[PDB]
Amino acid sequence: LDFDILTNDGTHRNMKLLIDLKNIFSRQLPKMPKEYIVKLVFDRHHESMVILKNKQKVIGGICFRQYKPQRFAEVAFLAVTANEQVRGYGTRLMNKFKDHMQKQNIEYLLTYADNFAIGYFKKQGFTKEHRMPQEKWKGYIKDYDGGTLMECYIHPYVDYG
């Protein structure tokens, strides 16, 4: 059970894992155009941290994009495969993600959420009220009126993990 960063480096090994992850995303996020998930998962700007069981099996993951200069990252997709849910993996993944983001000198996590997800992200520490200057993400993160923008502050020395 490892939580590794996975990126499109063009190798058969990583590529397969990214596809497996992409397939989990689509099955777990039916309202999302599959081709859209594909585009973000394999683009130059996005990265994926995956939950790997004994070295060759993706059971979950989180695809995100860092805006280094700005020191914030947007969560694009998050999911755990059906037969592995309710085992605490999704929470350990988020914890692992925040710890990694902290080491990456990232100050805030932003993610759009809707319906049930808002409550889920509140449990992970995300809030509707942003302490981060709005003009910091404006122009980098698309502004959608139909979605609730949520943020999680990553304190430099709070232990997430």
Partner: peptide, 6 residues
């Protein structure tokens, strides 16, 4: 992050 009533 589509999650509509998931």
């Amino acid at each position: 992050k589509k999650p509509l009533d998931g």
